[PDB]
């Protein structure tokens, strides 16, 4: 009844058309579709709630997401109960992910600065509401066809379990399993800016346990070609990748950094989107 006071009434099978499956997350199945009245493209996650545990957690997470929108977060539109399934409808960003741009183009520092600024705007908002994203990385940055930049995926593994993937975006204080705060996202942003300029995530050729150790002890990964970065970009990276949590910049502080002032207009990202789409098809 809290879900019924959270969802909308109506038939989403009538409001939307052209359903196309993308894939299946842990939550549920994800489709793209189009609003029959406005032509807006949407992404719809269908979740069988009969039954997933911590259902109230999904209800509350969706609750919070509906009341705290922001231009740099993928916009929540509506939810519907469709026969024991819960459908969550989000706006659809058709420009793909930042990962595709990073791997198929070489971004210049003005383009990187523009992405960093848009992400830092999102993080300032999240941190002001005491939200920690924890997975700031390129596959969680979605791009609009106008060059808009938005965060997604801000929604647990045993000591006894082996590590299969490398958590290359995680701050040293996360990796050493300490308590931590919003500035882990700033660290992750620094790592993503290195990814943008090098074209691949750091530690790519490392086993996860070796990378875990390097993160805890070295902190920043060694830039492959540091001579290739401008002084102001290198300074920005140093402020994001400070091992001392107190010294590491906050999002509010870094929004004032001079590196962000070389940002190109966001229209400068749309040729990157075009290249990535040509390259991946």
Nearer to a copy of itself by Cβ, of 113 and 196: the residue is 196
* CA pair distance 92, 145, nearest whole angstrom: 10
Minimum Å gap between C-beta 209 and ligand A1BV8 is 18
Q: What is the DSSP letter of 39?
A: -
Query: What value does the CA radius of gyration of the chain take, rounded to a whole number of Å?
Result: 20
* CA pair distance 277, 201, nearest whole angstrom: 20
Nearer to a copy of itself by Cβ, of 18 and 210: the residue is 210
- Interaction of residue 39 with a copy of itself, rule CB under 8 A: no
- The overall longest dimension of the chain from CA atoms, in Å, is 60
Per-residue tokens: 79: 């939810």
Q: How many residues bind ligand A1BV8 (CB under 6 A)?
A: 22
In the list 3, 6, 34, 62, the residue contacting ligand A1BV8 (rule: CB under 6 A) is 62
- Interaction of residue 192 with ligand A1BV8, rule CB under 6 A: no
- Interaction of residue 218 with a copy of itself, rule CB under 8 A: no
In the list 59, 74, 196, 269, the residue contacting ligand A1BV8 (rule: CB under 6 A) is 74
Burial of 66 (0-12, 13-18, 19+ CB in 10 A): middle
* 32 touches 41 (CB < 8 A): yes
Minimum Å gap between C-beta 76 and ligand A1BV8 is 6
Nearer to a copy of itself by Cβ, of 10 and 213: the residue is 213
Stretch that binds a copy of itself, among 19-27, 34-42, 88-96, 225-233 (CB under 8 A): 19-27
Question: Other CB atoms closer than 10 Å to residue 74's CB: what's the count?
Answer: 22
In the list 176, 218, 224, 230, the residue contacting a copy of itself (rule: CB under 8 A) is 176
> What CA dihedral angle connects 178, 181, 185 and 190, to 10 degrees?
-70
DSSP letter string, 258-277: GGGGGPPPGGGGHHHHHHHH
Binding stretches for a copy of itself (CB under 8 A):
23-24, 26, 48, 50-51, 53-54, 57, 99, 135, 137, 139, 155, 159-168, 175-177, 204, 207-210, 212-213, 216
């Amino acid at each position: 009844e809290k879900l019924r006071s959270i969802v909308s009434v109506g038939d989403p099978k009538k409001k939307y058309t052209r359903f196309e499956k993308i894939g299946q997350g842990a939550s549920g199945t994800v489709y793209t579709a189009m609003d029959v009245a406005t032509g807006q493209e949407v992404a719809i996650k269908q979740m069988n709630l009969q039954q997933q545990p911590k259902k109230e957690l999904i209800i509350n997470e969706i609750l919070v997401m509906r009341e705290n929108k922001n231009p740099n977060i993928v916009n929540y539109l509506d939810s519907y109960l469709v026969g024991d399934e819960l459908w969550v409808v989000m706006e659809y960003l058709a420009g793909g992910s930042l990962t595709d741009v990073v791997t198929e183009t070489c971004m210049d520092e003005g383009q990187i600065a523009a992405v960093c600024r848009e992400c830092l705007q999102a993080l300032e908002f999240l941190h002001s509401n005491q939200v920690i994203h924890r997975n700031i990385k390129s596959d969680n940055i979605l791009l609009g066809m106008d060059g808009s930049v938005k965060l997604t995926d801000f929604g647990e593994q045993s000591k006894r379990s082996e590590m299969v993937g490398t958590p290359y975006w995680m701050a040293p204080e996360v990796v050493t399993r300490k308590a931590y705060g919003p500035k882990v996202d700033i660290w992750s942003l620094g790592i993503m800016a290195i990814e943008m300029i090098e074209g691949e995530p750091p530690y790519l050729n490392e086993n996860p346990l070796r990378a875990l150790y390097l993160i805890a002890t070295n902190g920043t990964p060694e830039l492959q070609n540091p001579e290739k970065l401008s002084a102001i970009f290198r300074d920005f990276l140093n402020r994001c990748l400070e091992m001392d949590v107190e010294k590491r910049g906050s999002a509010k502080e870094l929004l004032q950094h001079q590196f962000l002032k070389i940002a190109k207009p966001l229209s400068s990202l749309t040729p990157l989107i075009a290249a990535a789409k040509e390259a991946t098809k």
